Amino acid sequence: MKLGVCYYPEHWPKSRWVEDAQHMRRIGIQYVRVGEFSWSTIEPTPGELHWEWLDESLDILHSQGLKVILGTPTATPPKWLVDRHPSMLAKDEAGRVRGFGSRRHYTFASLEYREECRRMVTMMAERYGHHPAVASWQTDNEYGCHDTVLSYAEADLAAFRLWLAEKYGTVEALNKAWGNVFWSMDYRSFDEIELPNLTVTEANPSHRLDFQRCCSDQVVAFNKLQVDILREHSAGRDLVHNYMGFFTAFDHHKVGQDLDVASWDSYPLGSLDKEPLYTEDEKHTYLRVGHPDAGAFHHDLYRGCGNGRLWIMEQQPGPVNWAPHNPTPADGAVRLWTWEAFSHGAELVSYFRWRQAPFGQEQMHAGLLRPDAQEAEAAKEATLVAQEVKVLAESIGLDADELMSLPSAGKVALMFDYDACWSLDIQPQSRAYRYFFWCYRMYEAMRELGLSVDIVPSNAPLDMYELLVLPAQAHITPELQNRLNSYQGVLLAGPRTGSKTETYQIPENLAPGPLASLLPLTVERVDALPEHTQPAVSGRWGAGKLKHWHEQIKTELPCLLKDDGGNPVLMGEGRHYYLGSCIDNTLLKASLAKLSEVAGLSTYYLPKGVRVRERGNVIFAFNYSSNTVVFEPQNAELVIGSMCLGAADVAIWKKQ
């Protein structure tokens, strides 16, 4: 439970630097990120290097006891470098070059830019890898931001053809896997295969899925080259990357295998206003705090990506610049979001930025300070959180390190698979269906029942979970099916689970494919629905509606929910259940409450806008609504806040 800030000493005169560091310390900041956009300062023209600024900045930060997270500057290479390597530039889906003048102007497939990255990261790692200020390295900055994973340039095609040869061996094997007999798509060789953009009409879903996988693998490779250098020259330092909200274009679990920590960038007001996930009512109700699960969903996903280790590298401190509308946060919201992250096991919450810049694209993005260096609202809220974590630590008899080590895992797991996300986005089949939205709405229902949750990859060990939910595990690997067969907890498999092979085909036995041995049923066909037609649901466990996706199923399993035609909606017995339609929020909660009971877990329908999470003996309660509500856990005493939770407020209790 530590605080941090993102800082740009290169944006401010050196006469500010000592004061900045002292002020950071006064607030309770312990970690500071620098360097990720500094390449033009380091090397304004090739071979003429400027390290003095950074040498001095790191010493000043160290002298105040601040631990530094050093960013490699590869997100924003200089124009002289771009001009030397025209093949490094990405092309968008429309076939146009994505040029210099903003950030992230490269394709991950560019071998020329990778060699330039090897040079610069080696230079930096050799100079600073053993500097006593440097505790951690951030590779690059927000891989994929602005939809930069998929690129449609010559370099991307060259990498794709090599990647396909490695996967399939022969083009004959690829043609069989893709079903290229269809529409006479058959290739004579790998070098006949083109990019999947700018086709007359829909490209083969197998083609598009393998393309996504390849592009994701280029992110893995790009990151891995930096990691290898940093392991060699900066032993003992935590290697981290900063991931984003509402972003699925590369496999974050796979990138995470090469790193020590998963960090992410949380801007609850920007995501609420911008994202089509949210309803009009939600955008209005939660304008100044964000949706109650916007941070939570990602804290749990990225704790999984980090193999237990989660940071927030960038936390919203005030209004941002980049959403269509940019409201000021509610008073107390920065405190709210900070404690929120700590309740999900975040080691560190780092704000961004330290001081609002008066120039450039983000001149309207707030910081802890205003552009004139006077304190803004987040400075006082951060100060309060730092005081409150000391109060908490003392109340439960722990030091800072023991506090951070409190357990964070939930006993309910939601399985999120990037490969499934890509498959389902490629052919949603109803335009109202989105894998991410469905996962998020299943998660919201869990959270409205007061459950503490882990979000896990498909290769995760399952033995520590009493309830396991697979919202839409489109392809089930033979190894996952083995883990499911031996799993001793309660399983809910959601619609479209086991509906696709590895190469984007329908399984020979139809959906749910490998799962059918565990859960004997057959999806005969799919009724894929618009928003305006929502069939009625009834049965043993509740009544309500279904929307978007409506599987027509034959089974002998007992039915817990059915439609008016008597067709199975939710079916199962003992410890195994299958859901074939996207049931509404009411029915999601009804079903999860029943399943939780089978699994030996308690549930509680929390008040609207209220959320709870546990870390060992500590209970964290949050109120995202605009009015005071009472939350009183049983057999516990108040440590921070009150039983009457204010609007945008936090209370912390300890079990007796």
**Distance of closest approach, residue 281 Cβ to a copy of itself, in angstroms:** 10
Least Å from the CB of residue 429 to a copy of itself: 5
- Residue 150 contact among Cl ion, a copy of itself, none, beta carbon within 5 to 8 Å by kind: Cl ion
Give the C-alpha separation, 354 to 367, whole Å. Answer: 5
355 is a contact residue toward Cl ion (CB under 5 A):
yes
Q: Which amino acid is at 474?
A: A
User: 112 or 194: whose CB is closer to a copy of itself?
Assistant: 194
Q: Return the residue of 4, 8, 299, 454 that touches Cl ion, per CB under 5 A.
A: 8
Phi and psi for 527 in degrees, rounded to 5? -100, 105
Residue 431 lies near a copy of itself (rule: CB under 8 A): yes
CA-to-CA dists, residue 315 to 367, 409, 547, 583, angstroms: 10, 22, 35, 34
Spatial separation of the C-alpha atoms in residues 187 and 184, rounded to whole Å: 9
- 425 scored as a contact of a copy of itself (CB under 8 A): no
Q: Rule CB under 8 A: is residue 332 a binding residue for a copy of itself?
A: no
Stretch that binds a copy of itself, among 277-285, 294-302, 415-423, 477-485 (CB under 8 A): 277-285
Which of 564, 574, 635, 656 touches a copy of itself (CB under 8 A)?
564
Question: Quick check: 629 binds a copy of itself (CB under 8 A)?
Answer: yes
Is 402 a catalytic site residue?
no
Q: Which residues fall within 8 angstroms of residue 507, CB to CB, at 6 or more apart?
A: 498, 499, 500, 501, 513, 514
Interaction of residue 170 with a copy of itself, rule CB under 8 A:
no
Q: To the nearest 10°, the Cα dihedral for 474, 475, 481, 487?
A: -30
CA distance 569 to 559: 7
Contact window for a copy of itself (CB under 8 A) among 126-134, 334-342, 403-411, 430-438: 430-438
Give the whole-angstrom CA distance, residue 648 versus residue 609: 9
Region near Cl ion per CB under 5 A, out of 1-9, 61-69, 589-597, 625-633: 1-9
Residue 357 touching a copy of itself (CB under 8 A): yes
CB nearer to a copy of itself: pick between 255 and 560: 560
Helices (H), 74-135: 79-84, 111-128
Q: Min. distance of Cβ 351 from a copy of itself in angstroms?
A: 15
Q: For this structure, is 142 an active site residue?
A: yes
Report, in Å, the least distance between residue 140 CB and a copy of itself: 13
Task: Identify which of 434, 436, 471, 466 has the alpha carbon closest to the alpha carbon of residue 451.
Answer: 466
Q: Omega of the bond prior to 353 within 30 degrees of 0, cis?
A: yes
Q: Does 353 bind Cl ion (CB under 5 A)?
A: yes
Phi, psi of 301, rounded to the nearest 5 degrees = -60, -50
Measured from the CB atom, the residue of 7 and 211 that comes closer to Cl ion is 7
Give the whole-angstrom CA distance, residue 470 versus residue 417: 9
Each residue of 526-537: b (16+ CB within 10 Å) or e? bbebeeeebbeb
354 is a contact residue toward Cl ion (CB under 5 A): yes
List the interface residues with a copy of itself, window 201-240 (CB under 8 A). Answer: 201-207
Cβ proximity of 154 and 147 under 8 Å: no
DSSP string for 222-271: HHHHHHHHHHHHSTTPEEEEEEESS--SS-HHHHHTT-SEEEEEE-HHHH
Q: Is position 482 an interface residue for a copy of itself (rule: CB under 8 A)?
A: no
DSSP 8-state class, residue 1? -
Residue 76 in contact with a copy of itself, rule: CB under 8 A: yes
Shortest Å, Cβ 345 to a copy of itself = 27
Longest dimension (CA), the chain: 77
Q: Which is nearer to a copy of itself, 112 or 186 (CB)?
A: 186
Residue of the chain from 257, 536, 600, 616 that contacts a copy of itself (CB under 8 A): 536
Cβ distance to a copy of itself smaller for residue 256 or 319: 319
DSSP code at position 306: T
When binding is defined by CB under 8 A, the residue of 13, 15, 276, 359 that contacts a copy of itself is 359
**421 is an interface residue for Cl ion by CB under 5 A:** no
Only one of the segments 115-123, 241-249, 572-580, 638-646 lies at the binding site for Cl ion (rule: CB under 5 A); that segment is 241-249
Q: Phi-psi region for residue 526, left (φ > 0), alpha (ψ -120 to 50) or beta?
A: beta
CB of 620 to a copy of itself, least distance (A): 18
Q: Between 432 and 471, how does the x/- string for binding to a copy of itself read (CB under 8 A)?
A: x---------------x-----------------------
Using the rule CB under 5 A, is 24 a contact of Cl ion? Answer: no
Nearer to Cl ion, 82 or 373 (CB): 373
**Element housing 41 (H / E):** helix 39-42
* Residue in 36, 43, 142, 444 annotated catalytic: 142
**Contact mark string toward a copy of itself, 600..619, x via CB under 8 A:** ---xxxxxx-----------
The catalytic residue among 314, 377, 381, 551 is 314
List binders of Cl ion among 132-161 (CB under 5 A): 147, 149-150
Minimum distance between the CB of residue 309 and a copy of itself, rounded to whole angstroms? 29
Q: CB-wise, 243 or 577, nearer to Cl ion? A: 243
Spatial contact of 298 and 291, defined as CB atoms under 8 Å apart? no
Q: Which of 47, 236, 276, 360 binds a copy of itself (CB under 8 A)?
A: 360
Q: Kindly state the tokens that stand for 115.
A: 């060699």
104 binds a copy of itself (CB under 8 A): yes
Q: Does 249 bind Cl ion (CB under 5 A)?
A: yes
Q: Are 560 and 571 in contact (CB under 8 A)?
A: yes
* Beta carbons of 414 and 455 less than 8 angstroms apart: yes
Judge contact between 600 and 612, C-beta under 8 A. no
| Residue 13 binding a copy of itself, by CB under 8 A | no
422 near Cl ion, judged by CB under 5 A:
no
Residue 534 in the binding site for a copy of itself (CB under 8 A): no
Give the amino acid at 468.
Answer: L
Quick one: which of 582, 584, 559, 561 has its CA closest to 572? 559
If one asks whether residue 362 binds Cl ion (CB under 5 A), the answer comes out as: no
One of 22, 257, 279, 328 touching a copy of itself (CB under 8 A): 328
Contact status: 101 vs a copy of itself (CB under 8 A): yes
- Cβ 413 vs Cβ 467: under 8 Å: yes
Q: In which region does residue 544 sit, left (phi positive, over 0), alpha (psi from -120 to 50) or beta (all else)?
A: left
| Cα of 345 vs its chain's centroid, Å | 15
Site for a copy of itself in 105-144 (CB under 8 A): 105
Cα distance between residue 521 and residue 425, in whole Å = 25
Question: Closest separation between CB of residue 353 and Cl ion, Å?
Answer: 4
Cα angle value 563/564/565 (rounded, 5°): 90
As measured in angstroms, the least distance from the Cβ of 126 to a copy of itself is 21
DSSP conformation class of 142: S
Residues in contact with Cl ion by the rule CB under 5 A: 7-8, 147, 149-150, 249, 353-355
* Residues labelled catalytic: 142, 314
